[PDB]
Design a protein around this ligand. Structure first.
Ligand code: ATP
Ligand code: ADP
Ligand code: ADP
Lengths: 100, 99, 98
């Protein structure tokens, strides 16, 4: 298992591409995005990205970048969970997630 | 980053409003809900509520579980999270990137 | 609260049943699956979340899925610490106690 940070960005759907770009630009290996509702009849549609980042700082870079660009104007929460990636060709490389 | 508990409630879709009410009542600053399938495939919903404290999360969990989980399928679990950003979650205070 | 591993498998939608079977076969008490998009532009995939009582059950599932599918199918499997607060099936009549 390879430590990861699960960066979660829940924010407005309309930022999807904007945030995907940020995620792509961060060098995060990918991301998972889903449609969600959230409150912060009063549920609003939003999207949740989950970006497993190799490092915390990458996650924060993404968070910071998203937040600074968008979170004044757009609803969003970014949080981060410890994860370990057990498998993820892209995330762990040909190396595998048990790089001995 | 502000420590949080990601309270996850996966339960029957029909409880959405009912649980949202509980969440709203808990003083949780918001929640994220999504449609999911599950076996425990039935359509259900997953709430994710980031709570400032563990006890809030448990209050919600306890409240939901007591009010619904003896009659409705549902799992509640809780993950450590840190909120990096979340106006509503961290307040005007911010999520205090330095602790 | 009962410690759990939230095994998350994000992979191609078409593996849903195949992975569900693996999950079911692992003796995981259940799983949550959702439709997701992902990049690794967005492709539709599924995220399973399996709360497993033990890490090794999660890894068993992960290993089984990854071995059986991840050479041919896109997917990431990762695992989070979780605690189950409630989950009849997950914690048994015993309750989530701890
Ligand atoms: N071990 C688990 N891992 C991940 N998700 C779970 C787990 N157990 C339950 N869930 C989620 O919570 C839902 C409710 O599960 P529960 O065991 O309480 O009821 P169930 O009647 O078995 O549900 P189902 O209708 O899915 O069979 C499940 O469908 C699933 O979405
Ligand atoms: N405490 C929380 N737990 C989980 N998700 C949250 C929480 N607070 C906010 N969210 C998610 O982030 C989204 C935006 O939240 P926020 O910026 O507070 O603005 P708003 O009040 O305009 O929805 C919500 O719709 C929800 O999906
Ligand atoms: N760093 C990551 N963070 C979050 N999810 C990821 C990450 N990398 C991959 N995924 C998820 O796994 C899926 C497939 O992974 P991958 O093996 O990279 O295939 P692909 O590159 O063909 O999409 C992605 O579409 C995405 O949902």
């Amino acid at each position: 298992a390879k430590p990861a940070n699960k960066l979660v960005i829940v924010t407005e759907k309309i930022l999807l591409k904007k945030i995907a770009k940020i995620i792509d630009e961060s060098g995060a290996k990918g991301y998972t995005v889903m449609n969600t509702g959230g409150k912060g009849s009063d549920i609003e549609a939003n999207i949740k990205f989950e970006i497993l980042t190799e490092t915390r700082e990458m996650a924060e870079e993404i968070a910071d970048r998203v937040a600074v660009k968008y979170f004044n104007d757009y609803a969003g929460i970014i949080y981060i969970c410890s994860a370990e990636v057990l498998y993820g060709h892209t995330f762990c490389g040909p190396e595998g997630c048990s790089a001995w």
